């Protein structure tokens, strides 16, 4: 049970950052 992106449910790790996740995976958000 880990924290995940509150939009797409992709799991976050110690390496994830919001900026990198949003830039790679989201378009309208």
């Amino acid at each position, epitope marked *: 049970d880990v924290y995940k992106c509150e*939009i797409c449910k*992709m799991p976050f790790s110690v390496y994830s950052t919001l900026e990198k996740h949003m830039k790679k*995976w989201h*378009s309208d958000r």
Partner: nanobody, 117 residues
């Protein structure tokens, strides 16, 4: 206008293979990362695999890494999930959706995948 028609599920034996397809229409498909999700009955909707707008990056859940391959054809507005070495733990309904709008909870019909033994 997000219409998402998933197909290709069925009954398959453990160790076997299946390819799921999702045809997308009513939005600018090329602009959105897509994900394949699954929900077993009684369990939570979980992201299985994802692919960026251009296919320049993919994501796989740890339990399917090395067994599933996600791809997309932006000319056909289609997302594919090739599933090899299927296990009973893979039984669920599979859905495809644009990552940006998963939070809004409008899901397609999905496709049933049942892995026996």
């Amino acid at each position: 206008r997000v219409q998402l028609v998933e197909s290709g599920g069925g009954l398959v034996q453990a160790g076997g293979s299946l390819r799921l397809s999702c045809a997308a229409s009513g939005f600018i498909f090329d602009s959105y990362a897509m994900g394949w999700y699954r929900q077993a009955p009684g369990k939570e909707m979980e992201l299985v695999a994802a692919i960026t707008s251009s296919g320049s990056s993919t994501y796989y859940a740890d339990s399917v890494k090395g067994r599933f391959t996600i791809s997309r054809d932006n000319a056909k507005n289609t997302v594919y999930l090739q599933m090899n070495s299927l296990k009973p733990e893979d039984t669920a309904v599979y859905y495809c959706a644009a990552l940006d709008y998963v939070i809004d909870g409008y899901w397609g019909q999905g496709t049933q995948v049942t892995v026996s033994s």
